[PDB]
Amino acid sequence: VHHPPSYVAHLASDFGVRVFQQVAQASKDRNVVFSPYGVASVLAMLQLTTGGETQQQIQAAMGFKIDDKGMAPALRHLYKELMGPWNKDEISTTDAIFVQRDLKLVQGFMPHFFRLFRSTVKQVDFSEVERARFIINDWVKTHTKGMISNLLGKGAVDQLTRLVLVNALYFNGQWKTPFPDSSTHRRLFHKSDGSTVSVPMMAQTNKFNYTEFTTPDGHYYDILELPYHGDTLSMFIAAPYEKEVPLSALTNILSAQLISHWKGNMTRLPRLLVLPKFSLETEVDLRKPLENLGMTDMFRQFQADFTSLSDQEPLHVAQALQKVKIEVNESGTVASSSTAVIVSARMAPEEIIMDRPFLFVVRHNPTGTVLFMGQVMEP
């Protein structure tokens, strides 16, 4: 049989890429950075706290049940493999559950959560609003090595909050072949918002794994693999041949299996690679993307079912979000993501940025885990 971490990595990545797809289809040329692994991690925990049809919708969308034989163990084996020193490049991931101290939990829940996730439920008092907000924000800052410090703004949680599920993901890698200094090769970028920014354009000519594919409508696109120095992780970069072809032509067919096929079809060939040196930070609302995949019950006040956690009072999801930051330069890439599901009663808005972009995917190849992916503005 296949290496177990590779099987669950595929389920997690396929689910996460489908969520990204809904995000892409909703806003033409959106500039955003995202983490498929991060969203899969938090929704895996959500499986244990929900029940009835709310839990059934999540399990159907993810393709597995967290408590079925071998699933939790294989997921644990997977994160240990991602974080191992043998990767050379560094990955850190941590999950946590924060629950209201006076919410009576159902018999067996806490010990079962510990058995599957090897972690205990962190109890806090959301009635001390600012103290609770600080506890969660400080935890996130620590587990993202200081990259994401204010995940929860004032008002995100309050005395009505009862549960907060979070995943913190950090990645720091060096290119196998660094780019030469790009500080004298800046270029003007004219945004649709009317402003203009100056961006260093990094460049190098060498042999890279590369391949060409076509969409269902016969449109061609280039795909190049840029490896990190431990040779287990890499960044795939994709863009259409013709500036006339919209990026949606690629994103409307994206999947974990497709990305696997890209890798399997590559040939090491000479190429001139040009990549901008930049920093991008975005925050995405996951409500509609998740509803679009079938998980509608969890967001409805009187329909949601959290009886696997508590039968003391009705509960539903008020907010589901992901904050991500990425930095790309001549030496490498540093990226962090914090995903959270907040059970309370107050939701928030989302800000959207748009400009014709290219696509990128950061992947751990030995297991096929898709850690980060995004759309970045092209010159």
- List the chain domain ranges: 1-170+281-325+336-345, 171-280+326-335+346-379
- Beta strands at 233-240 and 220-227: parallel, antiparallel or unpaired: antiparallel
Any idea what DSSP says for residue 120?
A: P
CATH number 2.30.39.10 is the correct assignment for the domain at 171-280+326-335+346-379: yes
Report the CATH architecture of 1-170+281-325+336-345.
2-Layer Sandwich (3.30)
Nearest alpha carbon to residue 322 among 31, 38, 27, 37 = 38
Experimental method, per PDB record: X-ray
What distance in Å separates the CA atoms of residue 74 and residue 4, rounded to the nearest whole number? 6
How crowded is residue 301: how many other Cβ atoms within 10 Å of its Cβ? 11
Q: What is the resolution of this structure in A?
A: 1.8
What's the half-sphere exposure (Cβ side, CA atoms, 13 Å) at 323? 17
User: What stretches of 247-348 show up as alpha helix (H) in DSSP?
Assistant: 248-251, 256-264, 287-292
How crowded is residue 135: how many other Cβ atoms within 10 Å of its Cβ? 18
What's the half-sphere exposure (Cβ side, CA atoms, 13 Å) at 170? 15
What distance in Å separates the CA atoms of residue 98 and residue 100, rounded to the nearest whole number? 7
Q: Return the exposure string of 86-122: e unless at least 16 CB atoms fall within 10 Å of the residue's CB, then b.
A: ebebbbbbbbbbbbbeebebbeebbeebeebbeeebe
Is residue 50 packed enough to be buried (19+ CB in 10 Å), middle (13-18) or exposed (0-12)? buried
Q: To which residue do tokens 């490896």 refer?
A: 227
Q: What is the 3-state secondary structure of 173-189?
A: EEECCCCCCCCCCEEEE
User: What stretches of the chain show up as alpha helix (H) in DSSP?
Assistant: 4-26, 36-49, 52-62, 71-83, 109-117, 129-143, 248-251, 256-264, 287-292
User: Is 259 in contact with 277 (CB distance < 8 Å)?
Assistant: no
